[PDB]
Every structure is written in C-alpha cells, then in structure tokens.
Design an enzyme around this catalytic site. Structure first.
Site, PDB file in Angstrom:
ATOM      1  N   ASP A 283       0.813  -1.224  -0.085  1.00  0.00           N
ATOM      2  CA  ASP A 283       0.048   0.168   0.099  1.00  0.00           C
ATOM      3  C   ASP A 283       0.788   1.563   0.223  1.00  0.00           C
ATOM      4  O   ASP A 283       1.214   1.692   1.109  1.00  0.00           O
ATOM      5  CB  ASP A 283      -0.836   0.073   1.394  1.00  0.00           C
ATOM      6  CG  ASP A 283      -1.675   1.153   1.300  1.00  0.00           C
ATOM      7  OD1 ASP A 283      -1.933   2.057   0.237  1.00  0.00           O
ATOM      8  OD2 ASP A 283      -2.510   1.235   2.184  1.00  0.00           O
TER       9      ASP A 283
ATOM     10  N   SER B 124      -0.810  15.560 -12.106  1.00  0.00           N
ATOM     11  CA  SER B 124      -0.998  15.198 -13.174  1.00  0.00           C
ATOM     12  C   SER B 124      -1.339  16.512 -14.052  1.00  0.00           C
ATOM     13  O   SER B 124      -1.798  17.411 -13.705  1.00  0.00           O
ATOM     14  CB  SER B 124      -2.334  14.174 -13.362  1.00  0.00           C
ATOM     15  OG  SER B 124      -2.637  13.929 -14.759  1.00  0.00           O
TER      16      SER B 124
END
Ligand code: NA
EC number: 3.4.23.22
Length: 330
Positions: free
Chosen positions: A35, A199
């Site tokens: 994770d 992004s």
C-alpha cells in the site's frame, strides 16, 4: 541489494493485490497488500481476536526466533474506506522477493475491522508511503522501504500491477524490460506523507486532452481512480445510461456498455487506461448495473490514482533525497 516479488490480484475484479512476504525465523509467509498510501506493516497474528480471523494466515511471533516485542509500542490505523486495525509491535526479519530487512517493525493486530476479517485473502498490509505516516506510538517506525533503502542498489521501488493478471514489485532497480518507451518523472510533495504529484490533465476516449493540474496520490492500496467531480462527470457523460447513484455509492453504468479509455498526463507524457480497466462488474450478483472504476474524489479531500490508473503504467517510486515518481507505458 535488490528484491523482486510477484503481486497477484485477490479476485477477478483486481480489487487488491497480494504479495508474499517472509516474516520471522523460520520464515512465516504471509500475503500482504502493498500500500503506497500508508506506512504501517501490520499483520493478522496469533494476537488477533479469534472471532476477527476468518481464513487469514497469521504471524505467530512466539514461533520466530528473531521476533522481539517492541516494548510499549502500539499502533492504530484508520483507512480512507472506513476500515481499521490496531495492536502491538514486534521487530523481526522481513524479506520481500529476496530482499531482507532485519529489525523491521511488524505491527501485530489485536483488532481488525469487519472488512479485513471478511477478506480471507489479505493477511495484512505493507505500507510504502513515507514513514512520517507510520502510526506506531510512542516511537514512530520506518517502512520496509525506508529500512531497506540504504542497502538497495538504487533507492527506488517499482509497481507493475497487472490487469486481471499478476504483476511485480521490484526494490532497488528498474527493470528496463518491463515498460515501453521512456519513463517520465514528475515531482512529489511529501508534505502529507504520500506519493503526491500533479497530473497535467486528462482525455476521455479519443477526445482532446484537457490541460489541467490534478494533484493526487499514487496509491496501490486503493482499487479505483478518484478524481474531481468535473473530470468524472466528463468521463461518464460518454457512457450511455451512466449515472451517479447515491444508493450504490458512485457512478454505475449499464453492463452492456463498452467503456471509453481514460488518459492522464504525466508531464508531457500520457498514460492511457483502457476502457475495460474501468469496469468493476455488477453492483450485486446478477445485476445489469455495473460499478465504475473512475469515481469522484469530492468529500475524500484528495484525488487518488489507485490501481485502475497505476496498473496501466510501470510506476517508479524514487526515494532519493528529493523523491520523484516515474510513469512509463507498458
Ligand atoms: Na465496492
């Protein structure tokens, strides 16, 4: 040193991925969910409340000659999905894919929430976010990667998750055979303890690319792609009959649909998530309503590039002094 381990989807939907981890001496092999959005290595154990164990493999520290109680240390964690676990702490030898760390904090669960109990395939989590998120008190502990780092050939790990197939976690090297083209690196903020990046935008299907900054985290422990509601609505507007269902808890779509791809930007580069990756199947067994793999992050307070996005790429988690993320197509 390096390590290389195969990671396997737990079910037919890629709800999560498990990676075998050797703990203790002699080795006890547990299948952990790696994770990158958390920083605790915790396991089902001989200490876990018996009614909260249903099929998991447990770590029994009393059977490991290298286990030592980390006296006084406790831990308690709550995840984004509402699940939680807590317990006490041992140090022990932990190996992943041939890479060994001695003195790793292994957080032994005394209590786990129902979602953990109900998932017989996940024996615990191995956190790969920054150690500043580790929950051990009163002495915060290091992640497996942070403990391994100085021994690694390069201070990196990579996630290469499969679509309905096994993939690989590598430590300490880039496998130049595992991706196409070049790796585009992008800046990381560690201020929230995550692999947080920005992004450069998105496209829906064959549509034009929208240049827009989307701050979010690279999180292998989250199944889906959570993005701002504007982006998500733009995506699902391209699917006939898709809608946001308050009753189901997100966007659903007719199972008869063919989904468009979703592209996200990494600098000037582009990662394309095929449409099929966004199909999470019937909302209940036999339903013709299917759950979408792209969901709104509104009310979660962060955008999450979860497995739906990451499995479309070869992802480099660069833990150099100034961390960075890399993405390549594959
Ligand atoms: Na679900």
């Amino acid at each position: 040193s390096t390590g290389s381990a195969t990671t396997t989807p737990i079910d037919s939907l890629d709800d999560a991925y498990i990676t075998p981890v050797q703990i203790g001496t002699p080795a006890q092999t547990l299948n952990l969910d790696f994770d990158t959005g958390s920083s605790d290595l915790w396991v089902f154990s001989s200490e876990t409340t018996a009614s909260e164990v249903d099929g998991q493999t447990i770590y029994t520290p009393s059977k490991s000659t290298t286990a030592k109680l980390l006296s006084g240390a406790t831990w308690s964690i709550s995840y984004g999905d509402g699940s939680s676990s807590s317990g006490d702490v041992y140090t022990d030898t932990v190996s992943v894919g041939g890479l060994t760390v001695t003195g790793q904090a292994v957080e032994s669960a005394k209590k786990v929430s129902s979602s953990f109990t109900e998932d017989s395939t996940i024996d615990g989590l191995l956190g790969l976010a920054f150690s500043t998120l580790n929950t051990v008190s009163p002495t915060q502990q290091k992640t497996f990667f942070d403990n391994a780092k100085a021994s690694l050939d390069s201070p990196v790990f990579t996630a290469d998750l499969g679509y309905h197939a096994p993939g690989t976690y590598n430590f300490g090297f880039i496998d130049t055979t595992a991706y196409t083209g070049s790796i585009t690196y992008t800046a990381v903020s560690t201020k929230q303890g995550f692999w947080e990046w920005t992004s450069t935008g998105y496209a829906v299907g064959s549509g034009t690319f929208k240049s827009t900054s989307i701050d979010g985290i690279a999180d292998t422990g989250t199944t889906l792609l959570y993005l701002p509601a504007t982006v998500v609505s733009a995506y699902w507007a391209q699917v006939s009959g898709a809608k946001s269902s308050s009753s189901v808890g997100g966007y659903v779509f007719p199972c008869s649909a063919t989904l468009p791809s979703f592209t996200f930007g990494v600098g000037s580069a582009r990662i394309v998530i095929p449409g099929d990756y966004i199909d999470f199947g019937p909302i209940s067994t036999g339903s013709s309503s299917c759950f979408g793999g792209i969901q709104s992050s509104a009310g979660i307070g962060i955008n999450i590039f979860g497995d739906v996005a990451l499995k479309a790429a070869f992802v480099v988690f660069n833990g150099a002094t100034t961390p960075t993320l890399g993405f390549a197509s594959k």
